[PDB]
Design a protein around this motif. Structure first.
Motif, short mmCIF file in Angstrom:
data_model
loop_
_atom_site.label_atom_id
_atom_site.label_comp_id
_atom_site.label_asym_id
_atom_site.label_seq_id
_atom_site.Cartn_x
_atom_site.Cartn_y
_atom_site.Cartn_z
N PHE A 186 0.84 -1.19 0.11
CA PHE A 186 -0.07 0.06 -0.15
C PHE A 186 0.79 1.11 0.14
O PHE A 186 1.61 1.33 0.66
CB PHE A 186 -0.95 -0.03 1.13
N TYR A 200 2.62 -3.89 4.51
CA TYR A 200 2.11 -3.69 5.88
C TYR A 200 1.50 -5.22 6.16
O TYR A 200 0.93 -5.80 5.29
CB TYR A 200 0.72 -2.87 6.11
N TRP A 259 -7.98 -8.91 4.42
CA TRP A 259 -7.46 -7.58 3.77
C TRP A 259 -7.54 -7.85 2.14
O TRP A 259 -6.51 -7.88 1.75
CB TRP A 259 -6.10 -7.09 4.24
N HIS A 274 -14.11 -3.16 11.96
CA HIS A 274 -14.49 -1.54 11.62
C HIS A 274 -14.84 -1.70 9.93
O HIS A 274 -14.60 -2.77 9.24
CB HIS A 274 -13.77 -0.58 12.12
N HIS A 331 -13.20 -0.28 7.59
CA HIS A 331 -11.74 -0.28 6.60
C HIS A 331 -11.73 -1.53 5.71
O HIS A 331 -12.09 -2.50 6.11
CB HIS A 331 -10.70 0.15 7.02
N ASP A 332 -11.00 -1.46 4.54
CA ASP A 332 -10.95 -2.49 3.74
C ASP A 332 -9.97 -3.68 4.45
O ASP A 332 -10.19 -4.84 3.69
CB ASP A 332 -9.82 -2.17 2.40
N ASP A 333 -9.10 -3.39 5.33
CA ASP A 333 -8.46 -4.68 5.84
C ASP A 333 -9.31 -5.40 6.77
O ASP A 333 -9.05 -6.30 7.56
CB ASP A 333 -7.20 -4.02 6.64
N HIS A 363 -9.75 4.57 16.70
CA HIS A 363 -9.26 4.57 15.23
C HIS A 363 -10.13 4.92 14.33
O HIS A 363 -10.23 5.52 13.18
CB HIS A 363 -8.73 3.09 15.20
N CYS A 411 -7.75 -2.43 14.93
CA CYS A 411 -6.81 -1.28 14.77
C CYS A 411 -7.07 0.01 15.76
O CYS A 411 -6.19 0.81 15.84
CB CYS A 411 -7.14 -0.83 13.41
N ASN A 451 -2.97 5.51 9.93
CA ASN A 451 -4.49 6.22 9.25
C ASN A 451 -5.05 6.58 10.37
O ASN A 451 -6.07 5.81 11.24
CB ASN A 451 -4.84 4.76 8.57
N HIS A 476 -2.49 -4.34 13.34
CA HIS A 476 -1.17 -4.71 12.64
C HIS A 476 -0.15 -4.92 13.50
O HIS A 476 0.14 -4.28 14.41
CB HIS A 476 -1.13 -3.34 11.72
C1 LIG Z 1 -6.70 -0.72 2.31
C2 LIG Z 1 -6.45 0.94 2.81
O1 LIG Z 1 -6.14 0.67 4.28
C3 LIG Z 1 -6.71 0.11 5.12
O2 LIG Z 1 -7.55 -0.56 4.95
C4 LIG Z 1 -5.99 0.43 6.50
C5 LIG Z 1 -6.96 0.34 7.22
S1 LIG Z 1 -6.72 0.42 9.14
N1 LIG Z 1 -5.12 1.66 6.35
C6 LIG Z 1 -4.00 1.44 6.94
C7 LIG Z 1 -3.08 2.97 6.52
O3 LIG Z 1 -3.59 3.63 5.46
O4 LIG Z 1 -2.06 3.00 7.25
C8 LIG Z 1 -3.28 0.26 6.55
C9 LIG Z 1 -2.13 -0.31 7.72
C10 LIG Z 1 -2.39 0.38 5.05
S2 LIG Z 1 -4.65 -0.79 6.61
#
Ligand SMILES: CCOC(=O)[C@]1(CS)N[C@H](C(=O)O)C(C)(C)S1
Ligand SMILES: [Zn+2]
Ligand SMILES: [Zn+2]
Ligand SMILES: [Zn+2]
Length: 231
Positions: free
Chosen positions: A31, A36, A56, A83, A85-87, A148, A167, A179, A209
């Motif tokens: 990402f 990550y 994720w 929650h 988010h995509d993860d 978060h 998270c 984030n 994470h």
């Molecule tokens: C897919 C987009 O990202 C995410 O779904 C998260 C959600 S907590 N965002 C974090 C960030 O942007 O640092 C991450 C650790 C990359 S995982």
């Protein structure tokens, strides 16, 4: 021993057994130019499994189901996303196609819809006010308040004294806020205090994470959040 980010290629999923009938699942994603790791939980419920969070994304979540079948060999019948988010929800459509019943709070389902993310099918009641807890199979789900994200849940496995913070809890090696676009920085330390007060007996604390630890991860997260607040 705990798989670290550097040890898992993107696309593969590792299982780590924490206790009798409790595992974490670990996946990775590239990402924004970096890799990550991401954690979820698997909890045995008799002859079935409860899944906490996707791995994720669709590809990782398909691999997660294959790895569970290979290593554990019991069916995943329910999954909870902690929650929006995509993860946490990315892969919900995979789980649904495979016959897993997917669950989230109504607040998570709303925010996922607004975001254009995958939406768990079922709505978990009884989690709308800070401090609310409900039993869900072999776990307790707890809404500690906004942190978060507005909707973040934590999960406790009483038989094993495992607290999954998602998270809302940072690993010790993370010293800067992550984030925080969807966070409530003002409320996050108070939400952490609610977790501490409700699960003082926790022996194994899993962040969303990175590496598990003890209850010290809660104060750690407060420290990092307060530092970011004063940035
Ligand atoms: C897919 C987009 O990202 C995410 O779904 C998260 C959600 S907590 N965002 C974090 C960030 O942007 O640092 C991450 C650790 C990359 S995982
Ligand atoms: Zn998140
Ligand atoms: Zn996350
Ligand atoms: Zn610290």
């Amino acid at each position: 021993e705990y798989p670290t980010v550097s040890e898992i290629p993107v696309g593969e999923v590792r299982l780590y057994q924490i206790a009798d009938g409790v595992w974490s699942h670990i996946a990775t994603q590239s990402f924004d130019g970096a890799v990550y790791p991401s954690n979820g939980l698997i909890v045995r419920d008799g002859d079935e499994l409860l899944l906490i969070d996707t791995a994720w994304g669709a590809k990782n979540t398909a691999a997660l189901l294959a790895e569970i079948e290979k290593q554990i060999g019991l069916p995943v019948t329910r999954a909870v996303s902690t929650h929006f988010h995509d993860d946490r929800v990315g892969g919900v459509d995979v789980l649904r196609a495979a016959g897993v019943a997917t669950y989230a709070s109504p607040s998570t389902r709303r925010l996922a819809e607004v975001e254009g993310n995958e939406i768990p099918t079922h709505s978990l009641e009884g989690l709308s006010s800070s401090g609310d807890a409900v039993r869900f199979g072999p776990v307790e789900l707890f809404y500690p308040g906004a942190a978060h994200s507005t909707d973040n849940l934590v999960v406790y496995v009483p038989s094993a004294s495992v607290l999954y913070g998602g998270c809302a809890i940072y690993e010790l090696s993370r010293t800067s806020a992550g984030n925080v676009a969807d966070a409530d920085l003002a409320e996050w330390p108070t939400s952490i205090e609610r977790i501490q007060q409700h699960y003082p007996e926790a022996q194994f604390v899993i962040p969303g994470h990175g590496l598990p630890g003890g209850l010290d991860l809660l104060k750690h997260t407060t420290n990092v959040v307060k530092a970011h607040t004063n940035r």
